Amino acid sequence: SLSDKDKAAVRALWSKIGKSADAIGNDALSRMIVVYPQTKTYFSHWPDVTPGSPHIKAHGKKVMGGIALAVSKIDDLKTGLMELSEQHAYKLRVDPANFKILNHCILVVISTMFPKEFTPEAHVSLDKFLSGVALALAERYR
Amino acid sequence: SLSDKDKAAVRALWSKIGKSADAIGNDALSRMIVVYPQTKTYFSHWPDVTPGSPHIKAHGKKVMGGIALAVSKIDDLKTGLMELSEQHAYKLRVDPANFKILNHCILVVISTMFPKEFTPEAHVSLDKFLSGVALALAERYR
Amino acid sequence: VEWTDKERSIISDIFSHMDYDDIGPKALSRCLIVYPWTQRHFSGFGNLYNAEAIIGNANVAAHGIKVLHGLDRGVKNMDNIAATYADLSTLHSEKLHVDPDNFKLLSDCITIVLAAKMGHAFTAETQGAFQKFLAVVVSALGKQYH
Amino acid sequence: VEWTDKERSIISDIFSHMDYDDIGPKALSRCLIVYPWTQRHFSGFGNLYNAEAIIGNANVAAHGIKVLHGLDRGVKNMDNIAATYADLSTLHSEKLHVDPDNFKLLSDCITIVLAAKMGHAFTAETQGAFQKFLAVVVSALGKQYH
Ligand code: HEM
Ligand code: HEM
Ligand code: HEM
Ligand code: HEM
């Protein structure tokens, strides 16, 4: 679970990097699809899933908006992300094993873009936060 | 997270199998040590860690008493298992990756001993419960 | 894995005493109930409405039996498992889009169903050899890097 | 893994441009802070009191550098990785009692530290080849069944 120290670290990091949420998402989704090819099937209904695709870029904005929502709902991720859980579980049927893969890609992207801000202390709290986001997104699965 | 349906299923299963908690623990710890040899190091201070050991049998009672405590604290595992978390994290320094291994061994033992009671519906709720126990035991780790 | 003669004997004994028609349907139905997201690969199987429906579904039974017979080729040649499952791997991946994590979930359900059947004969040593064999098959199917 | 020439070139390029003295200490200190239970293998390293202490600890730096040089033998012969790390595997297991899960945690910290250093040059394709190489090494060290 997230301590007050963790919540403060995540809010402070997001305060610094949030201006680049759209870029972080486009980059994170792009890497996920290339490095973990099994995830491409979920986006195959889009007319372009190749590197540089405008659909991946547009979707990246939505994904990091979900992370921004999670930061605002950090005190209760289960309630805050319930609708997103239902959508991934029932409408999209995204296998839940993939949440940790996108989380790792988000940490990689943040490291490439904000090396100074993404210190080991920012990383420990963000990692605990992303595990919490994954657990909340897994809510409606079983 | 555990729904009311999950809590009722775990309480009903435990009501049926709890009389054999001691045996389940001895069996679960015995399998863990044999099948996942990396876990033996945590028990090496005991004078006998070989199959059939009286220390493993005695400890098995304690482990399932912790599961019994978790069933009683099912509505708030984090608070209920906080002292056990601190003990595994600080005093024993048990690597947290091992909680899911013991959980799997407990499910195997329950299946061998109570095949009729351990239906797929009992299994889904118990598995969600054991993941919750692992997450609560991981509380004091980072 | 460098198999010991004892591991080979255990695996051979297990498979020769297994009733595939009983174990196969139970393992797959258990996987569909405990990890319900796996039901998405079985849309046209019909009744997948609830636990009772899944457990009695003859299409689910047929597939669970296929899974167990799919392990036979591994049992037959324990030193060539990764090569043996290469085509099955491509099928589940490229054609079926089964998430590689799902093979592990199903293999734990097979182990749990076998444990229920064998009872006290499913000793720690038996469990170790059986899970080790399933781990090798799961690695080949999921195309794990090694 | 059957390496493509492109994967071999990427891995060679990465290691030839890596400053081990910078990347090694950062990766290990990051692992000790993000997954603090791993600090238990470094009792006699001295100052492990808090993040600042860990990051500046010269013993932690020395070990992180050793880890990176430990990857060189894998880079040198990419087709014989599992055999090459067999002795290191026995050391970390039998003598050191390092949990096999810990190799994966450390490898993710190495990837994250390299990403911070390379910045935009750490492309998806670069990340894929690097992680694939670390996955093979992690499998050999942790003695995963395949
Ligand atoms: C950090 C975890 C994640 C967050 C916060 C997240 C958030 C979102 C958000 C906000 C939406 C838009 C929902 C809407 O339509 O209103 C969405 C849709 C979607 N997500 Fe996720 N998601 C995550 C992980 C994943 C993963 C791991 C996959 C698949 C591998 C995935 C696949 C999809 C798909 C297929 C859509 C719908 C795309 C479309 O509109 O066609 N998501 N996600
Ligand atoms: C289902 C998860 C688990 C439960 C509920 C559990 C519960 C317990 C309990 C109740 C105690 C006794 C605490 C006391 O001294 O008052 C204990 C001690 C201990 N546990 Fe666990 N435990 C779990 C998992 C693990 C795992 C995965 C390992 C190691 C691989 C482990 C290693 C130990 C050790 C080394 C001790 C102390 C033994 C001694 O007294 O010398 N535990 N555990
Ligand atoms: C220990 C793991 C498994 C083994 C050895 C295995 C084996 C097989 C075999 C032998 C077949 C028949 C191939 C054919 O018809 O040519 C098959 C097909 C298939 N498998 Fe698996 N399988 C495994 C795991 C899975 C998992 C985890 C899923 C899904 C979550 C899955 C989904 C399917 C589907 C949908 C079919 C296609 C056949 C049809 O729909 O009629 N399998 N598998
Ligand atoms: C990518 C993974 C890793 C590689 C390639 C690696 C490499 C090495 C190398 C080359 C040495 C020196 C061997 C010698 O002195 O003969 C070593 C020793 C050691 N390693 Fe690792 N290692 C890795 C991961 C780990 C992990 C995850 C831990 C602990 C969580 C760890 C703990 C140690 C310790 C405690 C020593 C003994 C040396 C001493 O204490 O002075 N290593 N490792």
UniProtKB/Swiss-Prot annotation, chains A, B:
Keyword Heme set for record: yes
Listed Pfam families: Globin (PF00042)
Top-level taxon of origin: Eukaryota
Modified residues (N-acetylserine): S1
Residues binding heme b, per UniProt: H88
Keywords from the UniProt entry: Acetylation, Heme, Iron, Metal-binding, Oxygen transport, Transport
GO CC, one annotated term: blood microparticle
Boundaries of every Globin domain copy: 1-142
Tissue-by-tissue expression: Red blood cells.
InterPro entries, sorted: Globin (IPR000971), Globin-like_sf (IPR009050), Globin/Proto (IPR012292), Hemoglobin_a-typ (IPR002338), Hemoglobin_oxygen_transport (IPR050056), Hemoglobin_pi (IPR002339)
Acetylation recorded as keyword: yes
Subunit structure: Hb1 is a heterotetramer of two alpha chains and two beta chains. HbC is a heterotetramer of two alpha chains and two beta-C chains.
Family: Belongs to the globin family.
Function of the molecule: Involved in oxygen transport from gills to the various peripheral tissues.
Note: This fish has three hemoglobins: Hb1 (major) and two minor hemoglobins (about 1-2% of the total). Hb1 has a strong alkaline Bohr effect, and at low pH exhibits the reduced ligand affinity and cooperativity that comprise the Root effect.
Name this polypeptide is given: Hemoglobin subunit alpha
Source organism of this protein record: Trematomus bernacchii (Emerald rockcod)
Lineage of producing organism: Eukaryota, Metazoa, Chordata, Craniata, Vertebrata
From Swiss-Prot, chains C, D:
Example of a GO cellular component annotation carried by this entry: blood microparticle
Keywords: Heme, Iron, Metal-binding, Oxygen transport, Transport
A GO term, aspect molecular function: oxygen binding
Tissue-level expression: Red blood cells.
Annotated ranges, domain Globin: 2-146
Family stated for the protein in its record: Belongs to the globin family.
The protein, known as: Hemoglobin subunit beta
Provenance organism: Trematomus bernacchii
